[PDB]
Amino acid sequence: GMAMNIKELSLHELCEELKTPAWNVPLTFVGDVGGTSARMGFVREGKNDSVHACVTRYSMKRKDITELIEFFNEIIELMPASVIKRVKAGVINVPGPVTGGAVGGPFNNLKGIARLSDYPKALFPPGRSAILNDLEAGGFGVLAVSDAHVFSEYFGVMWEGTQWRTCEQEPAGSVIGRGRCLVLAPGTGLGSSLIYYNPMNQQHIVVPLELGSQTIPMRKDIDYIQTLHAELKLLPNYENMVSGAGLEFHYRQVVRGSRPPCSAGEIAKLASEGDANACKAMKKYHEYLMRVGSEASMALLPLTIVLVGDNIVNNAFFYRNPQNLKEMHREALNHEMERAGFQSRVTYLRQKKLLNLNLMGCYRCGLDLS
Amino acid sequence: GMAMNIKELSLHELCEELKTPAWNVPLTFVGDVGGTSARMGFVREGKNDSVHACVTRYSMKRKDITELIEFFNEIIELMPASVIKRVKAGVINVPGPVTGGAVGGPFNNLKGIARLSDYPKALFPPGRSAILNDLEAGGFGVLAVSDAHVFSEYFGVMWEGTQWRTCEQEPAGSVIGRGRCLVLAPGTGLGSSLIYYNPMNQQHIVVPLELGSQTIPMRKDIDYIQTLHAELKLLPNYENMVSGAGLEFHYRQVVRGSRPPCSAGEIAKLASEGDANACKAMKKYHEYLMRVGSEASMALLPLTIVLVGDNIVNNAFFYRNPQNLKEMHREALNHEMERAGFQSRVTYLRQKKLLNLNLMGCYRCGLDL
Numbered sequence A: 001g002m003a004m005n006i007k008e009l010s011l012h013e014l015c016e017e018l019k020t021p022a023w024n025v026p027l028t029f030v031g032d033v034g035g036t037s038a039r040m041g042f043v044r045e046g047k048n049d050s051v052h053a054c055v056t057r058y059s060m061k062r063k064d065i066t067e068l069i070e071f072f073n074e075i076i077e078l079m080p081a082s083v084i085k086r087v088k089a090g091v092i093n094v095p096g097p098v099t100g101g102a103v104g105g106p107f108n109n110l111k112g113i114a115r116l117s118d119y120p121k122a123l124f125p126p127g128r129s130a131i132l133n134d135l136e137a138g139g140f141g142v143l144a145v146s147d148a149h150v151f152s153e154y155f156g157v158m159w160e161g162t163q164w165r166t167c168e169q170e171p172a173g174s175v176i177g178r179g180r181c182l183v184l185a186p187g188t189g190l191g192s193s194l195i196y197y198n199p200m201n202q203q204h205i206v207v208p209l210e211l212g213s214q215t216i217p218m219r220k221d222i223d224y225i226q227t228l229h230a231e232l233k234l235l236p237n238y239e240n241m242v243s244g245a246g247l248e249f250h251y252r253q254v255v256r257g258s259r260p261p262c263s264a265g266e267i268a269k270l271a272s273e274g275d276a277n278a279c280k281a282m283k284k285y286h287e288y289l290m291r292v293g294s295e296a297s298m299a300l301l302p303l304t305i306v307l308v309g310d311n312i313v314n315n316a317f318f319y320r321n322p323q324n325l326k327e328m329h330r331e332a333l334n335h336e337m338e339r340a341g342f343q344s345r346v347t348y349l350r351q352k353k354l355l356n357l358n359l360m361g362c363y364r365c366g367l368d369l370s
Numbered sequence B: 001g002m003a004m005n006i007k008e009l010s011l012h013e014l015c016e017e018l019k020t021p022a023w024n025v026p027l028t029f030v031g032d033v034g035g036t037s038a039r040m041g042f043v044r045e046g047k048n049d050s051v052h053a054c055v056t057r058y059s060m061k062r063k064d065i066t067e068l069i070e071f072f073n074e075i076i077e078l079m080p081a082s083v084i085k086r087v088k089a090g091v092i093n094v095p096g097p098v099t100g101g102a103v104g105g106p107f108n109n110l111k112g113i114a115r116l117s118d119y120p121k122a123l124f125p126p127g128r129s130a131i132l133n134d135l136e137a138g139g140f141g142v143l144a145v146s147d148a149h150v151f152s153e154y155f156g157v158m159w160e161g162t163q164w165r166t167c168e169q170e171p172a173g174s175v176i177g178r179g180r181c182l183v184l185a186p187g188t189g190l191g192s193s194l195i196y197y198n199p200m201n202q203q204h205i206v207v208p209l210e211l212g213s214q215t216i217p218m219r220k221d222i223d224y225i226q227t228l229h230a231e232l233k234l235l236p237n238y239e240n241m242v243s244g245a246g247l248e249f250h251y252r253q254v255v256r257g258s259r260p261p262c263s264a265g266e267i268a269k270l271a272s273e274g275d276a277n278a279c280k281a282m283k284k285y286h287e288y289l290m291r292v293g294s295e296a297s298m299a300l301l302p303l304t305i306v307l308v309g310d311n312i313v314n315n316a317f318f319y320r321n322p323q324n325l326k327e328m329h330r331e332a333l334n335h336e337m338e339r340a341g342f343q344s345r346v347t348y349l350r351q352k353k354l355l356n357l358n359l360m361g362c363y364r365c366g367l368d369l
Helices: A011-017 A066-077 A135-146 A224-232 A245-254 A264-272 A276-299 A310-314 A314-318 A322-332 A336-340 A357-367 B011-017 B067-078 B132-149 B220-230 B244-255 B263-270 B274-297 B308-315 B316-322 B321-332 B337-339 B358-363
Strands: A004-008 A029-032 A035-044 A051-059 A087-093 A129-133 A155-159 A180-185 A190-198 A203-209 A304-307 A347-351 B004-008 B027-033 B037-045 B051-057 B087-094 B129-133 B155-159 B181-186 B189-198 B203-209 B304-307 B347-351
Touching: A004 A135, A004 B274, A011 A051, A011 A066, A029 A051, A029 A314, A029 A357, A029 B129, A035 A066, A035 A357, A051 A347, A051 A357, A051 B337, A051 B347, A087 A135, A087 A357, A129 A135, A135 A180, A135 A190, A135 A203, A135 A357, A155 A322, A180 A276, A180 A310, A190 B203, A203 B011, A203 B189, A224 A245, A245 A264, A245 A276, A264 A276, A264 A314, A276 A322, A310 B181, A314 A322, A322 A347, B004 B358, B011 B051, B011 B067, B027 B051, B027 B358, B037 B358, B051 B358, B087 B132, B087 B358, B129 B132, B129 B358, B132 B181, B132 B189, B132 B203, B132 B358, B155 B308, B155 B321, B181 B274, B181 B308, B203 B244, B220 B244, B244 B263, B244 B274, B263 B274, B274 B304, B308 B316, B308 B347, B316 B337
Parallel strands: A004 A051, A029 A087, A087 A129, A180 A304, A304 A347, B004 B051, B027 B087, B087 B129, B181 B304, B304 B347
Antiparallel strands: A029 A035, A035 A051, A155 A347, A180 A190, A190 A203, B027 B037, B037 B051, B155 B347, B181 B189, B189 B203
């Protein structure tokens, strides 16, 4: 009964899976491309707008984005032409910027440039293909979850803002809402995209952002910011406070050289076990994330803010704690324009169950290419 | 030449104009509705995607948006049946929020709620009508200028960024460009909208923003910001620095009591005459506008930033001064992320010719229907 089903198989197994009756339907080709590995295969529609994907993991051995073409051709050389003929769209996500929806890179951990024109037209049909940024795909993934009617399975409400009930009929967290949805991916970095709903075309549009690189506006933390400024030799941006590196800094500031310096991972682990210093560090982290939220809540007027990614799912213990919710809520309203209720109109949600949003995003984006 | 013409006429004269052969063509009804006045009439297409509007000025004396209906009915009762038949679409802009392109308000300077359902279907035909927010119309107006091939007539390049040449072959400022365009409207307030470009279908989409209400992030101006904080009893936002009130503040800080306070109008006038203090005040204003630009250049990665509005046109003397332009440019690059060239990617343009972008936006939106 799962609405979102991903099976990871070998290439030979994938080829067998595709010849089963259930897969004798329109297919979308999808590729989730990370630094070390890529997951690529086919997505089909199921009962009740469910989504079934069958992908194969490929190792990016050469650390070269051009290697994707060898994978594409390997699939075309192995798959019967008659299976590939039912491919109606092709969309992949790459770990870097994309011009048009065609030309991807440069990348941090990979050589070369992803070019859609260099891809085989059999997996990437002309006029019905795209290369997306990871957070654009992420944001399309959020739609796909909404579309498959199981938003409440994958996203929990942290708190409901005042706008939700004036704009939406269903319970908060049961759908994305026909209103702007800001997606924040607080993990090692700070990924941001705005999902816009256009009334004039009956369509939701995913807009990648760089919220994380804006200079932190101050509250009553002048000294705290200056400590990081002196350390980074850079005027701090949100990502500086909301990142692995930021968490490590928050920890250092808490323990004041009375306990060893630790990593992001260790800090989160300690925090899950109730270590007060590590928890305090997490709170500082979340204080700065709520500042991204409060300012963007004003700049972009979102109906919702959704925190996504594995880091968020794994840190559920922080978001379930009612005390942490109150402190986050308080900070998310900490803005002069809260006097007119700008910050309190926004519903905040957190991803509460693991899902590769990118794969699903590739799928969902493909549906608008038709 | 003149590919974008807006003529302001009396109602009786407008009525005569519309019965002349040149206007015997599909028409769009348009209304730019502000706090004090409304401009409303008809737009037609001409040779080479040219655009011709005839509008009338209505006073919003009663300060009530419902009054628009009496204007609509006055136009229908006076205009020949023959002219009203040619209306194919009807779009107006209102100075506040709008849901479902239909229901507008509540407003800060006007009583009541704008409802498209109440409006006469002869001026607002079914399935071909909308109510826009002003910044959205503004943003559509920019497109309309681009569409009508005369971007270069209405907008001047302040400076060309690196990105423009990587996706356009024609001169910067000749078209809006296949990329995001951030519209900033520095006037009494500070309006903002992002004209998103969707690469997958080549569509420009107008997304209203509230960039002006964001908390100013610091550079080396901690003390300057605190001076305004202590005055406003509010942590300052961009609009606090970039507004009539902000300009007045800049002037006060420059003269430090030595001269009585002047108004924004007076400050601009003095600055056009070469008054050093007034010029310094305009520098300060523009310093904070470029800070909106530098931060938004990073958050929203635009291909262009376009400064629009009458205040920008009327202040051309400031932007023509090349020392002023260098100072603005330096501040627009004054961001940590300029080390990766993010601020330098962006082409900055200023509106250099008067044109009611909202009326043209209403027009352009009524073609996307």
